[PDB]
């Protein structure tokens, strides 16, 4: 519970820039002069959200099904060592 | 032990009236009045005993030996299943 609460700490403490309390007050407006020039919320997205190129893609995904193939053969094997099966063998 | 207790506190606060304690001195004397007028223990059952009509217990009864029929080849299923029924198979 604590490892999936951990997350909610971070994505408040990151996305948010590192101004101290004291200074937070500037930063309160620094996005409103912003939007006497900007009319339309397209600023930035500094979330997690890793996009990736194309090339990349392929050459990780291929990098994925190839352990999935090697996950699934352990499973299977890992399924006729329980002893359990050996008696239904 | 207290699942099993759970039941006597309200077989206790359920027949018995909504009178608070300064008012329950009336109800005290309302079953009294009335056996000036009455002469037979034969006022109410306030128990939880709830009679059923004929025509609604077929319809639950019916439905019941359905239900066992359907547990019954579950446990003789469960015994099967069980590894040990395996060995003397």
């Given at each position: 519970i604590w490892k999936f609460q951990r997350h909610d700490l971070i994505e408040e403490y990151h996305g948010?820039?590192?101004?101290?309390p004291p200074f937070i007050l500037l930063s309160h407006l620094q996005l409103f002069i912003k939007r006497v020039v900007l009319?339309?919320?397209?600023?930035?997205?500094?979330?997690?959200k890793n996009k990736l190129e194309k090339n990349e893609e392929a050459a990780l995904l291929s990098w994925e099904i190839y352990l999935k193939e090697n996950y699934l053969q352990n499973r299977q094997f890992q399924q006729k060592q329980r002893p359990e099966q050996k008696i239904e063998d």
């Open positions: 948010r820039p590192a101004a101290p009319k339309t919320p397209a600023k930035r997205h500094k979330q997690l």
